[model samples]
Every structure is written in C-alpha cells, then in structure tokens.
Target: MTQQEIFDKQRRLQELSEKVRTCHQEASALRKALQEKEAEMLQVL
Candidate 1:
C-alpha cells in the first residue's frame, strides 16, 4: 500500500477508537443510574 493510504487508514482507526471510548463511558454511566433506580424500587416493594 502507498504511504497516503496507510496514513488515511490510521486516521480513520483513531476516529473510530475515540467513538468507541465515548460510547463505553456513556453506557457505564447509564448502568450506574439503572442500578440506583433498581435499588430504590426494591426498597419500595
């Protein structure tokens, strides 16, 4: 492959990696919130 092609591929990979990181962080936050709500529900029940 050419140098430009390799560089472009690496750039795209970096962008995708960043997106995956953000998604993982958001999912973790949601899970924590859900756990808290579930605990509250159990107390009410």
Candidate 2:
C-alpha cells in the first residue's frame, strides 16, 4: 500500500522480466545448437 512497497515490486518485476528474456534467448540458442549437432550426427550415420 505504501510508495516504497510499490517501488520495490516494480523493481522485482523488472528484474524477473529481464531474467525471463535471458532464459528464452539461452533456450533458443541451445535448441539451435542441438539441431546442428543432430544434423552432424546423422551425416555420420
């Protein structure tokens, strides 16, 4: 209910949003790498 509480919540939300974005980017990168690895593996077979 206080201004300080609202400010703290906003800061937390911003931090969490940034973390989510980073995680999504990392996941996408991992997926791309996995696909490349699989393609290489299939070529060997």
Candidate 3:
C-alpha cells in the first residue's frame, strides 16, 4: 500500500485500458456492419 505498489497497480490498469480500447473499436466495426447487413436483408422481403 505504498509507492511501488501503486505503480504495480497502474500497470494492470494500463493493460485493462488497452483491452477496452481495442475491444471497443472492433465491436463498433462489427456493430455497424451488422446493422447494415440487417437492413439489406430486410429490404429483400
């Protein structure tokens, strides 16, 4: 519960932040693509 421990926790925090950033970017692309595809399929009906 001191200086070095704080940096250690910070390293974990940084990695989690990185994961969220990359994951959110991919999810956004997939989300947009899925929406467009759904619209196209609906138009066929």
User: Could you say which candidate leads in TM-score?
Assistant: 3
**lDDT winner, 2 or 3:** 2
Candidate 3 lDDT tens digits, 7-45: 999999999999999999999999999999999999997
Q: Higher-TM-score candidate among 1 and 2?
A: 1
Count clashing residue pairs per candidate: 0, 0, 0
Model 3 lowest lDDT segment of ten:
1-10
Off by over 4 Å in 1: none
Give candidate 2's error at residue 39 in angstroms. Answer: 1.8
A best-first ranking of the candidates according to their lDDT comes to 2, 1, 3
Cα misplacement distance, residue 37 of candidate 2 (Å): 0.8
> What is the per-residue lDDT of model 2 for residues 1-45, given as tens digits with 9 covering 90 to 100?
699999999999999999999999999999999999999999999
lDDT of 1 by residue, 1-45 (tens): 699999999999999999999999999999999999999999999
Cα error, residue 36 of model 3, in Å, equals 1.0
